[PDB]
Write a protein that binds this ligand. Structure first.
Ligand SMILES: [Mg+2]
Lengths: 120, 122, 215, 114, 48
RNA sequence: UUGGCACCUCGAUGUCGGCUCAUCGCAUCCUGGGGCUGUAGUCGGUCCCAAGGGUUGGGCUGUUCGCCCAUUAAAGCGGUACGCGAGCUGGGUUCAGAACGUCGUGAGACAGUUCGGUCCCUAUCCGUCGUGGGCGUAGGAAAUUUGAGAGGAGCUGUCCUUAGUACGAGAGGACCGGGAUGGACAUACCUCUGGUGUACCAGUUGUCGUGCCAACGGCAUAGCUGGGUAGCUAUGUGUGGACGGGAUAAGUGCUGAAAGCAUCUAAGCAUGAAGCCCCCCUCAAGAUGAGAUUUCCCAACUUCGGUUAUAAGAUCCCUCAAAGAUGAUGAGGUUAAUAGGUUCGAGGUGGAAGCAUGGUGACAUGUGGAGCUGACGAAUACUAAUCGAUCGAAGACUUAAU
């Protein structure tokens, strides 16, 4: 597994942040290496959401951030609720995958490979 | 793995209670010794009386190291404490009352007087 | 005599008669085929060329070594065999005992044979003096600023140069290594497996060459 | 198959007569000693302290106090020089490896049955 | 530790014969006809 | 070595010891082979041949040296700026402080002691250790190779037998020949024993948080503690220096004249060392002397190719690891198991959460070898290797055989 130029605690925090953000937004722009690493994390989250039981929910709460989503009609729910209530339903028949990576060119401030990582 | 300056408890009633190894016999560059290897040593602690007195330079044979030995079948034996027995240059003990368990690997080195005199050979 | 090509699977342990722990290396030797016969009057020396494994057939627009190219397919089609991934050749064998296209089978070896095994050692990459060459290190304390460097590289103005072969840092591993006087423990004809005693050079799933001990 | 070859080759020397035990049970191991004369059996009775990676390579270790000196004897699980393994008594522990018993002497190293 | 002599122009231009960049690994985009980076999204159109 | 001389260097050539790393000589310490002996054998002595390998760890001193303690087959002597400080140290020595003895009226001094006292430098060139690109090797490629040359290894103990049969008042005690095991060293490897194992499992303290209970998250060296997979590893597992040929050295000779004798030598023919060459391991055709074998590709314009663009084959680019600083190498790119995911395991941890029961409560038992699980094994196109581009032959003359 990659190190991403970061200590173990900082890498863990950054990966769970990136996972939560992809869950909230359904698609994010980031670096290639970080997307290659967050793919596994978010996909294991969707796997836990697909089981749906309480122990699995308690386990997925270990990784997700306490973030709030405002739906339409002023509907409000957490990232955990979105994981177990809308995204698990979207992938009940799919047996892996769950994410796609679209390489984009190098950014300007570095030569960093910017990528879109989305949900599928 | 007994090397020089290694302290060892002595497992007989010869008179010596502890020894420090001056040299492992058997060759130039030889550094460590295990059960069945003979060392030269100086006694550092002795009982009042007995034939071996503090400061003597004596030969001893190693019994029951805590590094332990492998056997040909892939079985290992290890002990709690390094131990040694003072020998009389004929591979025969100075004491008469060897104490503690003794590895079976000494039977090969012809320390039969030590092996027979031990309460347990393993 | 009697060599063969195979790939290393891993190490394990067997109990011999009288029950001794025998560390063994599992070598898988399957689809070995004689592809050529080198002869003194044609090549200047006698040997048998042995192909090992099984490539897929030629395809249009292949992008990897998985598929035989036309030169290799034609070469392996001159004998009647599928394209092979590893091709070596053996000099210790008697060429007349072998026939082109025949299958070098695992039971050419019998338990108790004494063999020489050749592999390519495990890679280590750029490594320093104390690991690449076993050199001792300097003091780690007592004001020392010499820890893992190589020592002097020479003398003073007499020389005024570094001699060839000074044992300086560089790329460790990946060399051809032959281990001598190993013995086969058993042969499994259905699994096509030779159990060799001890360990052989190379990573798991590498390539090993077994042949009769030259000593 | 390229994967089972380790297990395929090693299966024939796996024993099936060994009872079930876990780290913490005191068992008696009957070992075949071949002296110069015969093949007498000798018994090592002690507490299981650990056991390791499976297959033929599996190993276990038993610790005893012989004459005031702790003796640890480790065996391959499938070694043919074990005649018979008797689980003398079961033990309640909370670790897989009982290295902490190496520092204790006497009543400090007691284990409850079952 | 410190250069003993100048580096001549010849030596300098010899040393920097391999100091160059390669052309991008680019391909025409099938949908829009403009050049793009292979295995990347066409930035002019946004396809594939 | 101690000196003599003052020839290079004072617009600087760092001086002793030790460490690291060596390299060479032989006037040889051991091991190999010999002659002579006031050599009975084991022990020696002395001389000759031999530089292949080997040639210890401590106490005391800054020490080199030396003495001592234990070993060892042996603890060799010298050169390399008394090898090596742009590789290390800084105990001695040679600034500034202070003190003792001593000398000087004194300032101060002593190669007399004593305590203390800044060791800078990002490597341009050659050299060296590793890795790439270019062109060449008269077509363009894929693989398998020969070996001109080059490097590496090269040590040795003890025990048993012969055998107490071998010399012998005795005491002691084999040469050779045959086995068996070590020490040191070198290599490969992770099955075993262990070490580590910062995205593995568990216990636990303080405090803050997710509203609360319960369960979890952050931070405190990874908070700490107990275990631990792969990989990487030695102190762990294997293996090696085995033979055996060719020519020799010191030596020992056979035949044999010079010199009708003698004589190893002149002619001629033997025998003879761990040494020389080969044997063993590794690299190698840039071996410009560029080698060999097997296989693949083979046209249509020319207005005469100084010819396109393509074949065979590669690559760009992308998924990766048995490989890697980067190139490179190797596994793969949909006609696909390369990586991720998913599912099934191995190994590790050791008994999840939620309930139920028991207890006043801390807790305990049951559900239930439970739950979780980086790197290891298998299956599966669900996700990403989806489109495409670039490079890459048409084979020169002369002569002879044909
Ligand atoms: Mg100057």
């Amino acid at each position: 597994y990659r190190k991403l130029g970061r200590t173990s605690d900082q890498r863990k925090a950054m990966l769970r942040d990136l996972a939560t953000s992809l869950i909230i937004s359904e698609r994010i722009e980031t670096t290639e290496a970080r997307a290659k690493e967050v793919r596994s994390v978010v996909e294991k989250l969707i796997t836990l959401g697909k089981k749906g039981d309480l122990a699995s929910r308690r386990n997925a709460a270990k990784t997700l951030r306490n973030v709030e989503i405002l739906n339409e009609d002023e509907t409000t729910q957490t990232a955990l609720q979105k994981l177990f209530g809308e995204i698990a339903e979207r992938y009940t028949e799919r047996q892996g995958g769950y994410t796609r990576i679209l390489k984009q060119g190098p950014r300007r401030g570095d030569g960093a490979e910017s990528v879109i990582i989305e949900l599928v | 793995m007994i090397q020089q300056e290694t302290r060892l408890k002595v497992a007989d009633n010869s008179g010596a209670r502890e020894v420090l190894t001056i040299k492992v016999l058997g060759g130039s560059g030889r550094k460590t010794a295990n059960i069945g290897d003979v060392i030269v040593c100086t006694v550092k602690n002795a009982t009042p009386g007995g034939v071996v007195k503090k400061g003597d330079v004596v030969k001893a044979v190693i019994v029951r190291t805590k590094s332990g030995v492998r056997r040909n079948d892939g079985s290992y034996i290890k002990f709690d404490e390094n131990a040694c027995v003072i020998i009389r240059d004929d591979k025969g003990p100075r004491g008469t009352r060897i104490f503690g368990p003794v590895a079976r690997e000494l039977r090969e080195g012809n320390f039969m007087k030590i092996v027979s005199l031990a309460p347990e050979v393993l | 005599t009697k060599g063969i090509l195979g790939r290393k699977i891993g190490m394990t342990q067997v109990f011999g008669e009288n029950g001794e722990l025998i560390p063994v290396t599992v070598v898988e030797a399957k689809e070995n085929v004689v592809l050529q016969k080198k002869t003194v009057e044609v090549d200047g020396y006698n040997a048998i060329q042995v192909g090992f494994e099984d490539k897929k057939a030629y395809k249009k627009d292949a992008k990897s070594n998985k598929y035989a190219n036309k030169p290799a397919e034609g070469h392996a089609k001159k004998a009647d065999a599928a394209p092979k991934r590893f091709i070596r050749e053996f000099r210790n064998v008697d060429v007349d005992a072998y026939e082109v296209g025949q299958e070098v089978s695992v039971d050419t070896f019998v338990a108790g044979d004494v063999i020489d095994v050749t592999g390519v050692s495990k890679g280590k990459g750029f490594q320093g003096a104390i690991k690449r060459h076993g050199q001792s290190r300097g003091p780690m304390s007592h004001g020392s600023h010499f820890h893992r460097a190589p020592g002097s590289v020479g003398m003073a103005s007499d020389a005024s140069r570094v001699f060839k072969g000074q044992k300086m840092p560089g790329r460790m591993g990946g060399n051809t290594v032959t281990v001598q006087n190993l013995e086969v423990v058993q042969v499994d004809t259905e699994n096509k497996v030779i159990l060799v005693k001890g360990n052989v050079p190379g990573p798991k799933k590498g390539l090993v060459e077994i042949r009769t001990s030259i000593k | 198959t390229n994967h089972k070859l380790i297990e395929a080759v090693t299966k024939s020397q796996l024993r099936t007569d060994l009872p079930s035990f876990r780290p913490g049970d005191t068992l008696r191991v009957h070992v075949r000693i071949i002296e110069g004369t015969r093949e007498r059996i000798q018994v090592f009775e002690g507490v299981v302290i650990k056991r390791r990676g499976g297959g033929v390579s599996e190993t276990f270790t038993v610790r005893k106090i012989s004459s005031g000196v702790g003796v640890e004897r480790t065996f391959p699980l499938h070694t043919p020089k074990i005649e018979k393994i008797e689980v003398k008594r079961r033990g309640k522990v909370r670790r897989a490896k009982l290295y902490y018993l190496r520092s204790l002497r006497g009543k400090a190293a007691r284990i409850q049955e079952i | 530790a410190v250069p003993k002599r100048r580096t001549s122009k010849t030596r300098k231009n010899k040393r920097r014969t391999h100091f160059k960049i390669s052309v991008p690994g680019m391909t025409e985009c099938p949908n829009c006809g403009e050049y793009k980076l292979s295995h990347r999204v066409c930035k002019n159109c946004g396809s594939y």
